[model samples]
Target: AADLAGKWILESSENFDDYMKAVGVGMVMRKMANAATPTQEIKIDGDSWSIKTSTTFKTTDISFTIGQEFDETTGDGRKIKTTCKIDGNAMIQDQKGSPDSILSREVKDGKMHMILKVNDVVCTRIFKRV
Candidate 1:
């Protein structure tokens, strides 16, 4: 968890628009999301963690404990229960909802790689330290 504690800025992303469409995001919003580069700040304080994803249009802040399930709202405004688990260099987030989704983050080679999967759509985003 400590390894992921830092500010990261989006470098590039793939298939994000299709991934958003899979989750029922509006076409206009998806278009806007595809064009924005968001910055993320991750902080780990003992067993508690805070992750903030911010852009010019909107920002999302998620606070959770490792291995604990909590209700959260997705960027597309979906309400779901999510549980996060972290290992040495990887973090997995499981979202329990109608469609279900899994988001994984791995840090390697001084870069953060994130994969978001919903059904058949998969989106990959890479972030570099800011």
Candidate 2:
């Protein structure tokens, strides 16, 4: 999990708009979101961790602890209960209520691969360290 502590810039994404739509994001917001490149900053302080996803449209910051549950607002502005855990070198998050979702982050080949699954739609975003 600590391996994810760094700033990452989005390199490429696949089916992100579709995933956003599956999660109920408005069309206009999804259009704008899909056009913008985002930077993700991961920080670990003691036993707590926070990830900040910054883009031109909006920036979403989420804070949580490993294996702890917390209420979170998604990038598309949906509130949900979330639980995240570290498995091997990957950080996996499960969201409950409304749209069922799961997000996974892992470092591979010196890049961060962030995968988002909403319902059956899946999106993958690859980020490179800045």
Worst 10 residues of 1 by lDDT: 1-10
Question: Model 2: clashing residue pairs?
Answer: none
For candidate 2, lDDT tens digit of each residue in 1-72? 678999999999999989988888898988888899999999987669999999876788989998899999
- For candidate 1, the lDDT comes to 0.90
Question: Taking the tens digit of each residue's C-alpha lDDT, what string does model 1 give over 25-88?
Answer: 9988888888899999999898798999999879999999999999999888999999999867
Listed in order, each prediction's TM-score against the native is: 0.95, 0.95
Q: Supply candidate 2's per-residue lDDT for 120.
A: 85
Model 1, runs deviating above 4 Å: none
Q: lDDT (0-100) at residue 68 of candidate 1?
A: 99
All candidates' lDDT scores? 0.90, 0.91
Clashes of 1: 0
Question: What is the number of backbone collisions in each predicted candidate, taken in the order shown?
Answer: 0, 0
Model 2 residue 17 distance off true place after TM-score fit, in angstroms? 1.2
